[PDB]
Amino acid sequence: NFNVYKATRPYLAHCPDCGEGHSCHSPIALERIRNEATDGTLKIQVSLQIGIK
Amino acid sequence: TLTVGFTDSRKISHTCTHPFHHEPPVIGRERFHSRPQHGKELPCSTYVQSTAA
Amino acid sequence: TLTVGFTDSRKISHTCTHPFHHEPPVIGRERFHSRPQHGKELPCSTYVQSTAA
Amino acid sequence: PGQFGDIQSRTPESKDVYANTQLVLQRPAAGTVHVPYSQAPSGFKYWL
Amino acid sequence: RVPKARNPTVTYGKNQVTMLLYPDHPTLLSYRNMGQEPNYHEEWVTHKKEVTL
Numbered sequence: 592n593f594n595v596y597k598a599t600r601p602y603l604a605h606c607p608d609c610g611e612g613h614s615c616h617s618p619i620a621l622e623r624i625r626n627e628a629t630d631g632t633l634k635i636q637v638s639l640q641i642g643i644k
Numbered sequence: 645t646l647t648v649g650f651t652d653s654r655k656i657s658h659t660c661t662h663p664f665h666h667e668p669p670v671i672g673r674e675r676f677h678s679r680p681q682h683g684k685e686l687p688c689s690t691y692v693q694s695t696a697a
Numbered sequence: 698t699l700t701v702g703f704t705d706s707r708k709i710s711h712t713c714t715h716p717f718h719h720e721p722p723v724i725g726r727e728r729f730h731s732r733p734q735h736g737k738e739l740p741c742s743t744y745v746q747s748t749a750a
Numbered sequence: 751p752g753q754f755g756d757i758q759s760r761t762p763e764s765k766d767v768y769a770n771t772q773l774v775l776q777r778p779a780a781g782t783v784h785v786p787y788s789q790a791p792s793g794f795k796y797w798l
Numbered sequence: 799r800v801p802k803a804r805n806p807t808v809t810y811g812k813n814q815v816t817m818l819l820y821p822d823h824p825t826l827l828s829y830r831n832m833g834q835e836p837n838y839h840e841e842w843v844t845h846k847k848e849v850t851l
Contacts, residue, residue, distance in 0.1 A: 608732045628690055629689045629690075634691065669798070735801070736801045738800070
């Protein structure tokens with residue numbers, strides 16, 4: 592269920608390359624990438640929240 | 645490399661890029677590029693699309 | 698190869714294609730693909746976005 | 751630090767873990783907030 | 799801005815040094831003798847390797 596997200600909020604963070612070759616503060620940013628599965632799927636963590644108004 | 649992005653509510657785009665090294669592992673004694681129609685079956689692991697605790 | 702194009706006023710597209718060889722040079726004693734967060738600085742040259750005479 | 755057996759345990763359900771990797775912290779860059787570090791890569795992946 | 803490499807593992811012996819290298823992308827390695835005869839050497843490293851000098 593989505594009940595665990597009731598009191599949370601997103602945030603801003605530092606990104607090393609914002610498209611032009613310069614750094615900037617972005618509403619979307621990357622956390623660790625995991626590649627443990629043998630069939631080649633990936634799990635990615637970002638700073639925004641999907642599915643909740 | 646890996647890139648993510650989305651579109652704002654004022655029609656403005658945002659992106660961020662991080663370096664990475666992607667190379668899926670090899671299963672069996674042959675290297676192949678797609679899933680065949682006639683073949684053999686071997687074990688592997690994957691991710692399950694479940695939202696349970 | 699290198700290609701350019703645009704769209705006409707009657708919903709018609711146009712293209713032109715020429716051969717070329719693109720390979721950026723290397724700076725330093727390492728080959729890298731993107732911009733890191735932790736590192737050093739060395740001199741290089743760029744183009745300036747100015748319309749002055 | 752970089753061969754088979756950097757991490758060891760007695761059974762999959764145990765809580766006691768032994769580790770002999772290298773971990774050194776580094777100075778942060780000017781004007782940013784982050785925690786950089788240097789560490790040897792995993793040895794189990796290389797064996798595969 | 800350019801990146802920096804990670805530290806190696808070094809062991810000692812009589813009149814020799816053994817090093818183990820952990821590269822992420824192609825890196826250059828060189829060494830010279832102090833004194834009157836430098837005896838310059840150079841090589842490129844692309845994967846895990848062990849050397850003795």
